[PDB]
Amino acid sequence: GMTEYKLVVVGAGGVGKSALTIQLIQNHFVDEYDPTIEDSYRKQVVIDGETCLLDILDTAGQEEYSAMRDQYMRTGEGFLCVFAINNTKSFEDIHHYREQIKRVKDSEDVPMVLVGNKSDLPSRTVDTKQAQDLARSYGIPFIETSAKTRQGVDDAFYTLVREIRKHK
Numbered sequence: 482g483m484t485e486y487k488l489v490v491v492g493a494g495g496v497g498k499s500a501l502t503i504q505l506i507q508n509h510f511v512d513e514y515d516p517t518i519e520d521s522y523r524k525q526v527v528i529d530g531e532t533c534l535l536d537i538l539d540t541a542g543q544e545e546y547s548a549m550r551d552q553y554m555r556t557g558e559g560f561l562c563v564f565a566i567n568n569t570k571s572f573e574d575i576h577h578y579r580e581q582i583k584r585v586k587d588s589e590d591v592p593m594v595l596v597g598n599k600s601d602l603p604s605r606t607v608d609t610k611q612a613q614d615l616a617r618s619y620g621i622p623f624i625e626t627s628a629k630t631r632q633g634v635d636d637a638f639y640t641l642v643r644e645i646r647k648h649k
């Protein structure tokens with residue numbers, strides 16, 4: 482049968498979670514997507530010759546640590562932790578997202594990828610070395626993306642599928 486992979490995109494508001502998700506789903510850059518919309522989107526993709534079904538949850542809204550929200554995030558098999566390379570605060574928030582994923586999944590080795598988005602912009606404030614070194618501290622991959630040009634979009638999502646495959 483066709484394997485379905487449940488992927489969750491997390492990170493601060495404004496980092497480009499919806500833009501990255503829509504680039505994967507529509508193959509189009511969407512510069513405007515209601516920042517309050519949290520929803521899931523499916524796509525069949527060929528990753529290493531295998532057609533698999535991706536189910537992408539694009540998160541949104543304020544933090545809520547209820548039993549119901551934890552139950553819903555626990556359905557995720559892998560997580561993209563996204564920051565924007567021109568927003569230092571979004572990068573400094575990454576550790577909080579990683580800690581919450583580890584808590585709900587009750588595991589130290591949840592499939593996860595660090596994503597530095599907005600790589601097309603010249604206003605960089607987070608050095609690539611700092612981001613690579615954070616991924617190394619966590620023992621995860623780091624992917625540089627741009628939802629605008631499509632740089633790294635398949636690399637981010639497909640690496641996460643490969644991290645789920647190795648974890649199973």
Ligand SMILES: C[C@]1(c2nc(-c3cccc(N4CCNCC4)c3)no2)CCCc2sc(N)c(C#N)c21
Nearest residue numbers: 491543544545546550551554574577578581582585
């Ligand atoms: C979605 C997620 C999550 N979202 C946040 C979140 C959201 C908005 C702002 C912030 N800010 C951090 C920096 N300080 C200001 C608040 C943090 N944290 O984790 C990440 C995945 C696992 C789980 S489980 C659970 N109950 C969550 C929630 N709600 C989550």
Ligand SMILES: Nc1nc2c(ncn2[C@@H]2O[C@H](COP(=O)(O)OP(=O)(O)O)[C@@H](O)[C@H]2O)c(=O)[nH]1
Nearest residue numbers: 494495496497498499500512516599627628629
């Ligand atoms: N230049 C550039 N702008 C981006 C990129 N991704 C998102 N944006 C912009 O960043 C803002 C936030 O994007 P959005 O996808 O709504 O972020 P979300 O709140 O994390 O879902 C919008 O103004 C987007 O046009 C990207 O890779 N490059």
Ligand SMILES: [Mg+2]
Nearest residue numbers: 498499516541
């Ligand atoms: Mg959004």
